[PDB]
Amino acid sequence: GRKSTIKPATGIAVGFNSGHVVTKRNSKRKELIKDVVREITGFSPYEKRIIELIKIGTSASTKRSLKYAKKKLGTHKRGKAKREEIQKVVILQRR
Template identity: 35%
Template sequence: TKLFEQCLFTFLKGLFTFEVDEFLKKGRKEYQLTMAPRYELAVGLKKGYRTTKIRWANHLAQKTSKVVKMRPSRLKGLQTKNNKFTRDLVREVCGHAPYEKRAMELLKVSKDKRALKFLKRRLGTHIRAKRKREELSNILTQMRKAAAHK
């Protein structure tokens, strides 16, 4: 049993933050076990460097945690209030571009992957294609809701 307890304590020492000698002196019932904070460590049992959680932000936020600004490439084409108003106005006057109409037809018949491939070919990057596909699918759902209300 003594050997078993020693093995158990060495195992527990890896999981919990406490001194084994103090644990033996005070006894099991009197000692309060405290778990080590998991989020401060990279991977495994107490492994790696202490890390802080990284939050992505468009603009600088609170100074309490580490904040990293988004890459400019991710910000390109992002909708702002003015930008959205202008695009909606243009969309109302001009309608959709031919490639958007074709992508919407593909989305109507549940060919999402094909629509993504098509949009990627037309727009150039995977991220822009995904954003456009999401935008067009939202337009389709709005059209369906409008048709249901009539």
């Protein structure tokens, strides 16, 4: 059960914000290195496919890309993070 870090807890034993009544208490180098690495190394092969899907720029193509990324890395979380990161690169490069 959630607590509140302001409006201190009710003295009762159950329900929301409950319990005993004591007074509760209370990036530059990274970019440079990454940029150097990108100039040396370029994209992954899968990343190249992902770039082409993002470049197509449609709901079907983007949906396919998200699913593809999920298959390649395993799990939604990793795939989504990668798709957003590549998409951001594609927008920036296109600009």
